[PDB]
Point group: C4
Chain length 243, copies 4
């Protein structure tokens, strides 16, 4: 049997949809899973994990997602802390597997806290609160981090979802540019292409129920108990819409 015959016969082999469907499932893309981040954090962090998480989130907010490159520009007291978190939590950088932790992932899993901390550390964010104020005045700090996306309640009146997203998008434009100078001249449709996929994924994620997300938005002052967004959020949405 020549190689040719072998290849021809193979084209006549069964193509069973049922068996293949199962394989696709095994091979399926496994995305971000906040539940697994929380698992890893709890297992590795022991009893003091919550305090560790807050430290790691403040770390992420002010210094980004590369914990080793971070050490090359840090006081020696800070390094004792960061090296200790790295070891305890086996911290990685960039985009590894489902059993690895990153500052970004941790910040995302605990978004509701991340976004309150951003208000506190606003003067030390890649894009600053004041920097945003210049674009839209009194810009809501709770919006100023990518993890906010996971706090959006999509069952809200469509007009309101739209105002919240658009206001966050305005921040994401400055942010995405600041993190990738390759975009600082790109078009607005282009910059938005660089974050809208994972943004939509978090908006429509099954982690945190609609009610849960809504309750957090009310605590942040983003919407009142009557579902009406802050003037400050509508304002920023206007500026975004004058694209």
């Amino acid at each position: 049997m020549s190689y040719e015959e072998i290849a021809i016969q193979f084209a006549s082999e069964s193509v069973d949809a049922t068996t293949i469907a199962a394989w696709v499932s095994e091979f399926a893309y496994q995305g971000f899973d906040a539940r697994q981040v929380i698992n890893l954090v709890k297992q590795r962090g022991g009893d003091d994990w919550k305090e560790d998480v807050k430290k790691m989130i403040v770390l992420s907010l002010t210094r980004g997602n590369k914990p080793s490159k971070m050490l090359n520009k840090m006081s020696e007291s800070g390094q004792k802390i960061v090296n200790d978190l790295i070891s305890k939590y086996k911290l990685k950088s960039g985009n590894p597997g489902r059993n690895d932790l990153t500052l970004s992932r941790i910040a995302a899993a605990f978004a509701g806290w991340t976004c309150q901390a951003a208000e506190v550390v606003q003067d030390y964010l890649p894009v600053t609160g004041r920097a945003m104020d210049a674009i839209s005045d009194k810009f809501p700090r709770a919006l100023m981090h990518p993890s906010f996306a996971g706090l959006v309640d999509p069952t809200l009146p469509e007009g309101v979802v739209e105002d919240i997203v658009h206001a966050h998008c305005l921040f994401m434009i400055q942010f995405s540019k600041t993190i990738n100078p390759s975009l600082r001249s790109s078009s607005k449709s282009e910059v938005v292409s660089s974050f809208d996929r994972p943004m939509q994924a978090a908006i429509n994620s099954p982690f945190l129920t609609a009610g849960n997300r809504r309750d957090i938005l009310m605590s942040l002052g983003l919407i009142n108990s009557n579902l009406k967004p802050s003037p400050t959020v509508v304002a920023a949405a206007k500026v975004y819409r004058k694209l």
Copy 2:
């Protein structure tokens, strides 16, 4: 004898065409060889190789050609399977030598099967069947993978070859863009430059005789027994030609 003299004399050394021709042959570029892929698969895979090949091809269709980067976004049950294929077949990524296997190579060697499987896993392809439907309606799924090129019978009436290629090119445009975002704004002549060399190589490859390729195209419903392409294939060729 100075270095100068040595270099001058060397310019007077023999330039024998016969001896050099042989050297060029030894040094010649050895391209893709489906026969050698089949060899390696058979040797390494033992008796269950065919089932393994199908698994590897479904893997390629849905997750691409980097099997290790693939593990970082896969369920744990899938990883047992993929790690096992990697070990058994010594799977590599990208473009290694003539004694190495890759998902892409395997998918290419068994193109006739690859292209039927793409119809089954169409909703999980980089560019989806429905996505193509928007560009040209009822777009033939059998075309939707680069390995299809090797199934083209070039001895067919030129008009028909042209319709089949052009229809496949329309898919290759979406595909090539989806795999390289650096092209998502490039011109159509530019995108096509990114795949037409290896495409032509497979169209004019001596692996699978004209009759063999033709027989597979008839099985796929791409042409009838009278050598006339599906309306659906002519349709897509029109859309490609309005470039």
Copy 3:
């Protein structure tokens, strides 16, 4: 307690500004510190450190900041010297931590000397003295190195600071282009973006008092004792301003 509940409760955890402020401090960005370069140089260099520093600075001026890539295009006598400096001072390349030395850092810490040496080795600089003469005649060599920025006295009459900076910027344009060919076609606002951040940082750095910087500028002949810049410096500032 589900992962959901855990994440919700965590959003209600304390956000104490005082404790967080301290963390930001620990995690704060630690920039270039000339004092620490001098420390490392003194510790590692022993008694002959000053001569070593001069050698390392002449090295930087003529061959750049990558000491290993440098060895691949150096006489064998030079390599004995460079390998010896590398070992003694544990020389690194690019941008490492606060306990590492680089030619660039050393050249910057000792800017007042660096800029006199540039006058001596002007024909062997990336951008040459004569090359600058073509742009603005008799261009002041003391300006022709990035470390000059740290010698600027910002308490000077604003008009004078402006002339000194602008004249240095004209050099920095040629320099920045020569070091990054990716800019050789870029706009002038774009090239300037590639050096003005660290330039401003050194102009407004607390290392070297205003009086100290001013005294060095007078020694270099850049300003007279009456605070009036060289004609040659005003000249170059004009050319820069016709951007």
Copy 4:
């Protein structure tokens, strides 16, 4: 003594021109040196070195300057030869130090032979003889390799040097594009920028006297004994000049 004082005093340290000049010499850029390539080849190659050099040059002409990446697309008989040359001559790729050999360097050191071989292996060159024929008919194959630059006698009548260079430049345009697709759309002044520095260096190199270079050009049929270039070379120079 504060760090400040130490830095101020250091600015008053001697700047002796004589001592510094010597350092610049030690640190000077050491470029390509054909004499040293010939040395390394002779030492490492033993008695059969000339045959080895010819093999290595035919290798360079048809497969480029990366000998390991080369093995991934080579017959198994060729690999026995190439691996043997690699070991014997300690072959490297890209741009290493003065004690390392590369196919490119070897081809350059023996340019007079390299350029005759290119005539023999013309159908297997990155840019082919026929490909050049389309641009300028009967294009002189002896020009079709970068090493040719070292064969130019610059003491020739300026008009003739100009015709020879320009004709070679036309090849270098196709070549430089073929090797760097990043240029396949670039302007002609831009492409030429990518090879004219080392080209000029070889034209004005002190390796091979004017008389030596001239004698080789006559052997190649590029000029007659009366210093008049082939019609075919003037022709190609015209096409280059219609830039």
